[PDB]
Amino acid sequence: XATCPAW
Amino acid sequence: XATCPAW
Amino acid sequence: XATCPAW
Amino acid sequence: XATCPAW
Amino acid sequence: XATCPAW
Amino acid sequence: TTALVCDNGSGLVKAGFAGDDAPRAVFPSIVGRPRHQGVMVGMGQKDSYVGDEAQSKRGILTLKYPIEHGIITNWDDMEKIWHHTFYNELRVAPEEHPTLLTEAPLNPKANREKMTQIMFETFNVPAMYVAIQAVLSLYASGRTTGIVLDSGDGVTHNVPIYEGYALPHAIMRLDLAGRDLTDYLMKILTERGYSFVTTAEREIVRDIKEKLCYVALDFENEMATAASSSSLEKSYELPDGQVITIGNERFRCPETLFQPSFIGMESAGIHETTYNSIMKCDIDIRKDLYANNVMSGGTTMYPGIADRMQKEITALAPSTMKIKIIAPPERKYSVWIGGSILASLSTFQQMWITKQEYDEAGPSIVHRKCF
Amino acid sequence: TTALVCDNGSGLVKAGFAGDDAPRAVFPSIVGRPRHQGVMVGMGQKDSYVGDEAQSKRGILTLKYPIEHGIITNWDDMEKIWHHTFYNELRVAPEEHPTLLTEAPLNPKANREKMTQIMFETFNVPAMYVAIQAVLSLYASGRTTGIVLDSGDGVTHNVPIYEGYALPHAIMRLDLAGRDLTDYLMKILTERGYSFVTTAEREIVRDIKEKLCYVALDFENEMATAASSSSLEKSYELPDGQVITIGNERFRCPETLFQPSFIGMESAGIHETTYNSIMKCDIDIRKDLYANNVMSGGTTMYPGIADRMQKEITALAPSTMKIKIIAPPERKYSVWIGGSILASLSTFQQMWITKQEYDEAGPSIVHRKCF
Amino acid sequence: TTALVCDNGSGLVKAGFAGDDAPRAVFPSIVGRPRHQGVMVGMGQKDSYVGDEAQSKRGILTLKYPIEHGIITNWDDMEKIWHHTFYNELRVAPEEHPTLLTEAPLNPKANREKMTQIMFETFNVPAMYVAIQAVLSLYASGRTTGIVLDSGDGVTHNVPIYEGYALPHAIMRLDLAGRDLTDYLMKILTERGYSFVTTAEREIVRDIKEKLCYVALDFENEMATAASSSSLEKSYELPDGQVITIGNERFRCPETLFQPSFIGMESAGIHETTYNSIMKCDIDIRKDLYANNVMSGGTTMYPGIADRMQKEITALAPSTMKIKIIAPPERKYSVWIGGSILASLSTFQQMWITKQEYDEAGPSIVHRKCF
Amino acid sequence: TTALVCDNGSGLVKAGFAGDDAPRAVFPSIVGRPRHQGVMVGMGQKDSYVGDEAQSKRGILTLKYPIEHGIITNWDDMEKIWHHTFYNELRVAPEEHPTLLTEAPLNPKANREKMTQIMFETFNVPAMYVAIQAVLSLYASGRTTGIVLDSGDGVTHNVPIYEGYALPHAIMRLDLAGRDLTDYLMKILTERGYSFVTTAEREIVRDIKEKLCYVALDFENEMATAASSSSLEKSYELPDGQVITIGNERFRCPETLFQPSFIGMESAGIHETTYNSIMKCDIDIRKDLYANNVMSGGTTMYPGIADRMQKEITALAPSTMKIKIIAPPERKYSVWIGGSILASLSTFQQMWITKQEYDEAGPSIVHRKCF
Amino acid sequence: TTALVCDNGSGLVKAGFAGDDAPRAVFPSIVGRPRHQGVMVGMGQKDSYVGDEAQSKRGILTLKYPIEHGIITNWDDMEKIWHHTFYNELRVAPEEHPTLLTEAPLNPKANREKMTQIMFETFNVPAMYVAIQAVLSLYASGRTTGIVLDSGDGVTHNVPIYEGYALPHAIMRLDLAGRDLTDYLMKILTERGYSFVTTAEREIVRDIKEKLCYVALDFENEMATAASSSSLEKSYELPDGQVITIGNERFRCPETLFQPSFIGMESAGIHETTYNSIMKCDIDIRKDLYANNVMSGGTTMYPGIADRMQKEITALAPSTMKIKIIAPPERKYSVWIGGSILASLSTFQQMWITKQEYDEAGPSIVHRKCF
């Protein structure tokens, strides 16, 4: 959900 | 040289 | 029991 | 220098 | 000075 | 009543019955949809294709993966895949049997919680359970100590275990994967004049990687050998009918596992992560861990990978002790193998989660029971 | 001729002149070096950056700390930092003035001995001296008895002093630190979907900790309050432009100072160490130590930390006596404050180490003079 | 001794001297040969025509391009064009001056290697050098950060640069071109009764495109406006003397840059490629890249293209930050402008390749020196 | 019916049958419990470990001593140890045989009284008896006069005996121990960079002490010899595989028996206590006590300890008389040796305590009978 | 010109002017010196402390008595105490006034001879005189016959006097003291778990003795009363803040004055010494001595001591005669009271020792004049 782009 | 057609 | 610390 | 890891 | 121990 | 063992990794999906030595269903997890226009009327059509059938017709469809890093991104594509396994590929009723599912160590909480509702509410199935894909590698070996290493395709990680006691402050997780090795290869081949840019073109780049790639024991002299002599230069044909000649990129692609700077990711490497995992442990149980290095990833199948790890750690360990890397030949299905043992085990029968337990608390019961 | 007072802790570096109430140079101690490739020609480049300038450009560099636990690990990075203070940040000649340096209580011998050669041989500076960072806290209070407690970022420790007589068989040192609290926080945030893994990503995790964290007076009901009501749940934005929502991890991170089992380090805690330090002392001077607990660490700035230590020790002390924790509001620079007093002091002028004393004996003179 | 700056793109060929603000030779790169039979004797004939002369007599010849995608396809036609520039169009000796050539980012290796032999062996010319056509756009702006976007006629691509450090894992290249926009237009005009099928007919279809085409800010209401009202319907005459009436195909042709499905190429588009290029970068230097979008392609000259990119990215960026697209009015020759600065630069004079360097190693020296 | 002889000192526990020359069970007295989490199911687990088994697995457990100074601190841990000896290590029925236990001279009353109930009520055992661990050293020598000195690990003390008549106003007890010598050693080693802080780390500091330590005959010149010449500097390896180098701390650790100010305990020393014990005696039987100094402690095994006591007392005695320190080579088990003689002795058979005697008076019978 | 009266017993030191009813300076005679290390600089320090100031800071110092049995052991500590009285505590010039000193009956000769030089040579003081501390008790009563008994803290003794004629062949001296009663008490308290072993710990054992101790009239039934009923069991707190419970040792400590075998000293007792002193006298003046038993020791202050001496001697005297023990309530300062009378007496003025008498003979004049 932040800097990952799958989170 | 493969699938392009200029390579 | 006083000043030791096993008594 | 042994078990720390900065010593 | 003999058998006491302050003499 | 026999339990069901279902493994769902990134890529291949494996399933079977309990009490067996080999699975029955192995197929990739892809969802495809067409993109051109239909003309002819009399044919029977479908809006999507799921199993191996979508692999046969890749010249039309647009392929799509649901799982990216071990995280469920699209839930509606996931329900089609589980529906495909329970009915079409394998034939069973859902409400007859209990199931058993596997996950990753440090994924977030909502990943292992939304999948509780689906296995209870929309599938009326009793007695599910969730495991971790590092404990299940030791049951295939039958040991009780050691340190594991599984990569596969999603993530690489390692968990140290001593005498049945796990050490939670020593788990290391690295996001370098298997599909990142595919994507770096199709960048290097543009230096000779080959170009593969489509989601359909990607799978014939994967098939090159599995056939002719190796991990060299040295790196500097290999760049000088192949630059002078034309000895290791081989060839390969593709479904167009042409000939592709590949040399000097055979060993250069798996070298990013030892130097991740080629992508640009700044990290340590696959060998310093294993060394720092032992160093964060105690001082008295280090000796039983240098002699037990099991290794059971799907990516591990490159030739010459076992002798490379022998040479690297001895430069870091002190000069007295002894190292030993264990590599069984059937180390691809070993996560499914350990799942077969724990399901048919007698003591395990008090660790299930009944349906009444879900009605008392709800979907937050899974953080309490299983771990 | 005015003396120089230089404090070099782990992290921030503080310096100034003697006879003053506030320092002039406050900046972190980081050495960075680039990692990408240079392309454009006309710019003027440097191989490294030292002061606050390396903090401004963190999107390229790889940051690095020289000091880890209060021990100098890399000497070549240390000479760049002392050269940066004497010339660039503060402007002075080295050979004009005497200096004054501070250390830790139980560091090994070669740490306070290699730094004698650098302050004499490569810097032609007369009259240095080495102190201990617990005595210097009492001069800021002006008292003459009591027990101190300084943590900061390297190490936490405490020294009992009565009437100007120190008790060497009662000093306790614990290696739980400040940077270990940063590293445990970025492990907990992966339970919602946040991931910060880079040396550059570390500093925006530190900045969250300083703004919204508190030490709760109770622990068990706080886990039941925040699980039911959504009251203490706040938000924060980051330099990407997005929004982060944090609740239940605000108080859970500073609880490791009272239960160190969460890391895995097996020890006692910050309150039983203070209780066992008084108990190893005599029986007649315990009463003057329960009424004097000064407390001057950099880590001490959490809200609600003074009322927590009131409640804990009264469960261990007998029911008659009286406890009192003293906390001045400017308790961050207090180690520099006491250094300003002792330099301008009149009696002190026979305690310097002249340059001729080094030529007679050598670098082993420091174990005799200062203590 | 003044250096020579030669740009050879797909289509137009530009050249001039160093230290100037405008080139001197601008002409297309076409090689034509006749196809009918000669009858009259007294005239003087030639087998081929090269420069603007082949453009004047297109009613007989068969035109031919040497470069297709940025790749030299036919070498014998290329030697006629370089011979035409050094002697006929511009008058110079080759052996007197050094040269400077430009290329594309991800072309294969043999393209930039066969052109080393021609500039040394058959043309006795010292001190050549090869650059990249994205770095040279920043010198025309004078900045030192930002992200570029050049399309022209061969290929479209973009390179992010921060503080003189390029990021090699973020370069994106797309093969949608300028001549593909010409070829799609002459397919649409057959819906009214116009047919242009010859290599000579192609150039009067290009000349329609440059005069009356625009990029609409919206797409759905424009299809409903022009279907009801006959307002934007204009006219044009051709060298036969007739009248052509064109409406509804004016804006419909440049819409393939935003939806490439109209050709059938499956890709993302010109705006999602720029968004994914920033997203693959770091987290700390994204803010300086949303405020610096230079844009210097030859294809960029459509009216209404700057306001369209303002509207699109704000639907993808978060709601706080600020975007800014920079468009200088003389953005057509800007690749030649930056070539004039770097040649007359003082520091640059150690970056040439002398003739003795070629005699030591050979044609593989170019992969080491320049990059 | 043979009696049982059980010695339970601080640390090692020794036991055997009557009428023998050597014991059969020697093992430390430690109770350990785990602290990590269990994962693997199929293993068989225990909550605690008692004998030598807890020593083998010290990398998990938390070790714990029941006895601190010769005083039973935790009774529930003591019942596990006596249950381990009567059944597992040695195999016997409890109700078949009489027992015999040993104590310290000036411990409080409730220590030798709670252990009466356990040997009668929960263990149905007849005929127990309690002795004193200074009388039992003379039976191993066979003499009838002299002065003893036993230290071991709990406490050091000395009792003067003449012709079978003990002198109760001359007994001296000092609380300097054996485990205090271990704890001072691990403080000194932090001056070179070694740090051992865990209950598990303590036992590899004990093992250094037993191998290379000696008591020097002089102290001042030894500090000047080892500071100039590198002659007595030796080395040692640890179970990690590394090398430790120790010099100048070999003799410096047992010097606290002669100067107890290094800990901070203010007392006299091990030689002035023996001198003041003779001086408090009479004037006519001093001559038979200077010639009989038996010495049978477990701590006495340092090399060079017998020649040091020769040199010290002659500086205090008058110049005419003769001193003689007796040191048998098997002076470690000598407290068990004297217990074997007194049990098989014929006159002793009226000194037991029958079970009917406990039913008449109660647990206060032990202060009357035995002394 | 008023004379000075100085009493210096073992323990307390008393002084004042002549012609008064109460002294002015009462303080113990202790010399203390520090033992830890000084750290803080700005304080003002002293090497030793003498008066009541050394009593206030006992947590650091090592206390020391100069006088042991009535014999000056260390002369250098004695000169500090006399210097403290003449200047600091009491303010006077030494050369202005005559002095008056007291001693013990059978101390050796050099004790009363070295103190002649100090009162003449280093203190220029005229007219000293030495008395005996048994004659001075009768002046406080005003009688002229009787037998005295003074113990205090050094020695106990008794001198019979009839009609102003002393009987030198009847003086009895016993070395049982007051500090020996303190030392036996801190041996008995280790039977419950209390341990006080330091010179600083000794004074809080003295303070227990003065508050709750009594002399029982019978001994055998008191051992049976307190063993059955818990009636006389009291409590006391100490400066740590804890609670001490003492029963059965209240009366058991002063019973050694009647049976000295508990220490081990073989003698008669305090009542048979008084009976044998009368029996060695004549036959005609025994009747006036049974009716006059004055009793003026500092140790005499125990409750119940007067009724005990009534009961004991009537078992030894014949059945006709009458006994009577006299005990004034202010019997503590009575040795100073008699010193005030004899100094202000008119006939006494020819008994001084002038300074010229010392210059004629020397220090051996004191055995001739005073007696």
Ligand SMILES: Nc1ncnc2c1ncn2[C@@H]1O[C@H](COP(=O)(O)OP(=O)(O)O)[C@@H](O)[C@H]1O
């Ligand atoms: N012979 C091989 N050599 C190298 N890589 C392989 C080989 N066979 C399979 N792989 C890799 O294994 C990956 C998936 O393996 P596997 O671990 O079975 O699946 P998962 O990762 O889902 O558990 C594929 O991405 C493929 O790249």
Ligand SMILES: Nc1ncnc2c1ncn2[C@@H]1O[C@H](COP(=O)(O)OP(=O)(O)O)[C@@H](O)[C@H]1O
């Ligand atoms: N407001 C705050 N709350 C909690 N911690 C803080 C705060 N401000 C600073 N710190 C901590 O103080 C540490 C360093 O403080 P300081 O003691 O001044 O430096 P040093 O430890 O080098 O002497 C930093 O690591 C930071 O974590």
Ligand SMILES: Nc1ncnc2c1ncn2[C@@H]1O[C@H](COP(=O)(O)OP(=O)(O)O)[C@@H](O)[C@H]1O
């Ligand atoms: N006014 C215009 N509007 C749209 N396209 C144009 C215009 N002028 C030129 N072009 C396009 O620019 C292309 C070549 O431009 P340029 O970038 O200068 O050459 P190159 O691509 O070789 O560098 C031509 O194919 C033409 O289609």
Ligand SMILES: Nc1ncnc2c1ncn2[C@@H]1O[C@H](COP(=O)(O)OP(=O)(O)O)[C@@H](O)[C@H]1O
């Ligand atoms: N070779 C040795 N040198 C020095 N100390 C020793 C040696 N062997 C044993 N010890 C000490 O003896 C202590 C216990 O000895 P022992 O007297 O047998 O046990 P206990 O004191 O319980 O009777 C241990 O703490 C150990 O420190």
Ligand SMILES: Nc1ncnc2c1ncn2[C@@H]1O[C@H](COP(=O)(O)OP(=O)(O)O)[C@@H](O)[C@H]1O
């Ligand atoms: N209330 C009391 N009960 C018992 N003993 C006492 C009491 N008060 C004082 N003493 C004892 O008197 C001793 C000294 O008394 P004193 O005779 O005045 O001094 P000195 O013996 O020097 O003349 C002290 O050692 C103390 O033990």
